[PDB]
Amino acid sequence: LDSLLGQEKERFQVLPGRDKMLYVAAQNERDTLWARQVLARGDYDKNARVINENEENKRISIWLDTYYPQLAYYRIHFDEPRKPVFWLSRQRNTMSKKELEVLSQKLRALMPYADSVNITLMDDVTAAGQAEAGLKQQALPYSRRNHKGGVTFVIQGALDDVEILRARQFVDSYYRTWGGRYVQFAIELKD
Amino acid sequence: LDSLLGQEKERFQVLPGRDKMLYVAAQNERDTLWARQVLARGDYDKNARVINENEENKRISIWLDTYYPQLAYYRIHFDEPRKPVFWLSRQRNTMSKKELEVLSQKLRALMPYADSVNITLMDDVTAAGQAEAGLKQQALPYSRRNHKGGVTFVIQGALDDVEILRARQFVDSYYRTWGGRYVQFAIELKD
Amino acid sequence: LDSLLGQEKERFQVLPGRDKMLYVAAQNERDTLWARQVLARGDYDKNARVINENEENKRISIWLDTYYPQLAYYRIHFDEPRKPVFWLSRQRNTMSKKELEVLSQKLRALMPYADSVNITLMDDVTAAGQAEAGLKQQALPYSRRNHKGGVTFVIQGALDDVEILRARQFVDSYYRTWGGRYVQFAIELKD
């Protein structure tokens, strides 16, 4: 192994894979690019791979559209890349304990660098309540619409220039940890 | 250790970490930057770290969003960096004594330079009363609104140019020690 | 010790500290600056410190906001820097004799150059009566308003150019010995 040119290793969490390849978990896009380009100049292809939170989540989601298309989930969190956390829709999900254990091992196959994948049924009430709470904190009333498989919070109120930005950060916050798979959002000028 | 180029050490409180790294508690941003740049010219990376009150509080808060998302708190004070004080929402917090002791040890892990973290349940009545008192001292009446998990004091009155600045310092004062997590503020021109 | 370049020592009251450092009590800002700059050219840092009435009072007040935030006080007088006098709000203060003795020792820790700190409960009636008297001496009637924790004397009367200056000196006088912590002031044109 190594098959690593990350040094300076700041913002490069390098994890050993189960497939005998190295996965350099880069903090951001510019770091990912830096490490991939340097490894390529260095003739460390194939075995030396560079990854990040966004690409690995989308990669697993693409695999899931084919093998667990009915999986109701939120997002895979890579706060600890060696132990990814997989947020599932508590109520929309109808999988068994053992089926979820298989799902984890399948993601472990998708993530050789991961030791194990911690799949957790996240309370759909908590998802809805997180969105509810964030809006109410910003004095943003909403009308709750119902799209297939979820709800859409339509923010009421003629918002000011910066109040709109406040609502955009709220929306992004929910889309960072939960995603747009359960509560989606809209803005409409009222009152 | 050391792995220190702070000299002149004025405004650089250097504390030894539990992880065998040094944490230079700098008085301000310009000092933080000065020390980080000088340590870097000096080839004292990794083990020689430079920190401050604002970055360390935000760093712990980011960790808390993942592991104690339901933690109702105000702010972590670094008046004594070696013994950080952690203001919690007395009433909104439902944690036990031992759970709070774990929370402290978790922050001690987040702050190797800290000897211990003193977590204290701050009276939510006192928070509200601090805001109330600061406004009344400046002859600023307010309408108490209710956002999720707190209240919003909407300052009544067509304020003058400098009265507005008086209200801004009041608001900042509360946002310095309590933060915008319980009493938030607004201004509206009346009378 | 010394660790002193004050000479000419006129307007430089040099007091020995309990922390084995020297505190040059300078008469004014320009003297403070002069002594700090000269000590610095001289390589007498650390042990040779330069102080004044305004900075030392504000320094102790900042410490008090964290450890005795409920302390109702006026101002610390440095007429005799070696024995600072600490004016407290007689009625607003609810501290015991021994708690006040601790408060003094805490300020003695904040002021190594001080032998002892004389804390005195100043009659709030006298504070109010000082303000009352100063206004009445200048033929300035006022309406007594009530802000949280104090009163605001609103000066009645269309004042002339120099009468306004007379009221400003009155206000400053009260803000010199009592401060704006109990009786505050305003001006409004009437009659």
Author numbering:
A (entry chain X), B (entry chain A), C (entry chain B): 173 to 363
Task: Quote the study's own text.
The bacterial injectisome, or type III secretion system (T3SS), is a specialized syringe-shaped protein-export system utilized by many pathogenic Gram-negative bacteria for the injection of virulence proteins (effectors) into host cells. The injectisome can be divided into three major regions: the inner- (IM) and outer-membrane (OM) spanning basal body with associated export apparatus and ATPase components, an extracellular needle, and a terminating pore inserted into the host cell membrane called the translocon. The major structural scaffold of the basal body is comprised largely of three proteins that arrange into a series of highly oligomerized, concentric rings: two intimately associated proteins localized to the IM - PrgK/EscJ/MxiJ and PrgH/EscD/MxiG, and a third protein belonging to the secretin family of OM proteins, InvG/EscC/MxiD (Salmonella enterica serovar Typhimurium SPI-1, Enteropathogenic Escherichia coli (EPEC) LEE and Shigella dysenteriae nomenclature, respectively). In summary, we report the crystal structures for the cytoplasmic and periplasmic domains of PrgH and InvG, two of the main basal body components of the prototypical Salmonella SPI-1 injectisome.
